[PDB]
Amino acid sequence: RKYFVAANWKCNGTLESIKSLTNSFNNLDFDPSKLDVVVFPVSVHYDHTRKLLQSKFSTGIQNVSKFGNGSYTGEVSAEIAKDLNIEYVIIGHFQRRKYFHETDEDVREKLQASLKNNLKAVVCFGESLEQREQNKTIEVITKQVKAFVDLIDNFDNVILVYEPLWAIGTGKTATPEQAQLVHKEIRKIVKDTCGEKQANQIRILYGGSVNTENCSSLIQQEDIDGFLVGNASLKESFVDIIKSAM
Amino acid sequence: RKYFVAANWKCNGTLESIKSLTNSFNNLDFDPSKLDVVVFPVSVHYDHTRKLLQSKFSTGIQNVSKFGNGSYTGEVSAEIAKDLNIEYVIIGHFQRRKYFHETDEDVREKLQASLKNNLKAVVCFGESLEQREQNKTIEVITKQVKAFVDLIDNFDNVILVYEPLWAIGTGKTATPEQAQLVHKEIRKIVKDTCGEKQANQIRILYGGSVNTENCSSLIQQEDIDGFLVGNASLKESFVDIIKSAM
Structure with missing residues (x-):
């Protein structure tokens, strides 16, 4: 198994902080054939982050839509991510499930949309305190x-x-x-x-x-x-x- | 009042199609001091759209977070939008109320966040056929x-x-x-x-x-x-x- 280390920046970042952060990341000499290293910036930071990180880093987005192109104000389709060559998507993060009523069916349909459009998907799940207890x-x-x-x-x-x-x-x-x-x-x-x-x-x-x-x-x-x-x-x-993965 | 013509692209576009459309848009000579014209591209299309559109066109995003910066995977905070000089946000579009369970409470919180961060807000509302009948x-x-x-x-x-x-x-x-x-x-x-x-x-x-x-x-x-x-x-x-608004 090829190790996989991902940065979920969540809802964080400025143009300036990303500039200096990516710079320090770039200083790390690693072989992308020996491990996957993926950075997930905020949607509106994607182009900025992609350009500033060297090609050894993979990139992705923190969410994707279950609907295709069309009348879905605020959504980003898997088709749109494909056209931008956005390699990875996060699906099912507990914060989406918690704050935005994202269901198991939503997760299923987002994965389908992603795979149909040749996106690679990082799929999240996990039980709560009450469930474990x-x-x-x-x-x-x-x-x-x-x-x-x-x-x-x-x-x-x-x-x-x-x-x-x-x-x-x-x-x-x-x-x-x-x-x-x-x-x-x-x-x-x-x-x-x-x-x-x-x-x-x-x-x-x-x-x-x-x-x-x-x-x-x-x-x-x-x-x-x-x-x-x-x-x-x-x-x-x-x-x-x-x-730790090198 | 200053007239206000807005383009909500919803979940639509490719890099090629935006390139072609923005070129056509730029051909129109209007005075931004007397008329507001705003384009709302998909989040991941924002940078592309902003660089291609002449500054006479104002730009914005189709949704904004009700939360600030932090552990809100998938969201775009008003703080991040301000840092990127994103001028406008759409809040409460019916497609977000319909498909993503957005409430009046969400709309309030999104507006409070937008104004705190000096963003301009385009706030949507209106009644169903049942309600009108x-x-x-x-x-x-x-x-x-x-x-x-x-x-x-x-x-x-x-x-x-x-x-x-x-x-x-x-x-x-x-x-x-x-x-x-x-x-x-x-x-x-x-x-x-x-x-x-x-x-x-x-x-x-x-x-x-x-x-x-x-x-x-x-x-x-x-x-x-x-x-x-x-x-x-x-x-x-x-x-x-x-x-028609000129």
């Missing part, structure tokens, strides 16, 4: 993965992200050992629906709290193939997180 | 306007849009007189909630079906100050719709 982790994760997993047509082009919602903004912390066991179970779900070779091929990223300190303990786990990094990816020290 | 036009619009109207401090910087949902994709057609009557009631609602000077100052646009054949008849109405144009704004003949 009620011992429903597997039930929830199985439901969420099975909502879309049968549609994957290439197991280099879809990347899964486990978001331990139960350990985000709650006071709880997920250990690498705990994360590994969930990752193992996700891969098994992929096996049971898509096949063994397919399960062994697919990247499954950790989408919880990742920083320069814990990144190695996480990526060194057998079934954790990288991360979708949030706040730590807004810092110049993000290069040290990339280094 | 139940004789509830004024009741519905009064509620929608009062959701946000107290936030307006500068009445040059917020622009209202009447969307006759009853005559959009329904088979019904609004006459310019029927549009005028609603615009007049809207202005009275602003007068009684904000003051007479403010109401005479605020621009109120027609956001129903606008084309080259009906634009003159609409702009001639005393309380219709321009348009938020959809499908017709994707055509080179959109220059003729601008001309």
